[PDB]
């Protein structure tokens, strides 16, 4: 089931990069987290909204360098 495999690999990579962005408020982690969240399938709709809310919350806190 390589389809569902990749469907979940996109999710975990988005989770790790969003966590890295939350820990490192930088432009690099912002771009990587945004690209990773956008590539998550329509299946995990509510989970995508959660991670996108977390990216927006980090952007409200501000970022450095």
């Amino acid at each position: 089931t390589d389809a569902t495999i990749k469907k979940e690999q996109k999710l975990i990579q988005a989770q790790n990069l969003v966590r890295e962005f939350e820990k490192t408020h930088t432009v690099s982690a912002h771009r990587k987290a945004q690209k990773a969240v956008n590539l998550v399938s329509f299946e995990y709709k509510v989970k995508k909204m959660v991670l996108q809310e977390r990216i927006d919350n980090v952007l409200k806190q501000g970022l450095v360098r």
């Binding site: 089931t1 389809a3 569902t4 469907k7 399938s41 329509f42 299946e43």
Partner: protein, 122 residues
């Protein structure tokens, strides 16, 4: 198992919806070909785990100016260039060149093939 996997990928075409990761049992999917491509089969193939026989996109025909100028021929209505599967194309000779009777100047388009008639000078 009783559900279904991914829809079969056809050539020169694709499904008409967002590709699901897992497909439900008994659901049919619509297929569409590219431009001028003629479909041959049921556009909606139904879902056990094995999908129904997907339809086939029959290729069309591209009549380029290169092949025609090499044969010293034009079109009767000189210029659509593109022809669908079965559209009859009517060629004519060019100035000075006369027909060689190699093929009738009314050519059918089957899949990809299309036989070009020729014209020769005196």
């Amino acid at each position: 198992a009783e559900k279904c996997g991914p829809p079969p990928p056809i050539d020169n075409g694709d499904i008409t919806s967002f590709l699901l990761s897992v497909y439900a049992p008994g659901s049919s999917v619509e297929y569409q070909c590219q431009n001028l491509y003629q479909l041959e089969g049921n556009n909606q193939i139904t879902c056990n785990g094995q999908w129904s026989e997907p339809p086939k996109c029959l290729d069309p025909c591209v009549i380029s100016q290169e092949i025609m100028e090499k044969y010293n021929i034009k079109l009767k209505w000189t210029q659509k260039l593109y022809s669908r599967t079965g559209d009859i194309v009517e060629f004519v000779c060019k100035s000075g060149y006369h027909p060689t009777k190699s093929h009738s100047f009314r050519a059918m388009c089957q899949n990809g093939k299309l036989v070009y008639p020729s014209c020769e000078e005196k």
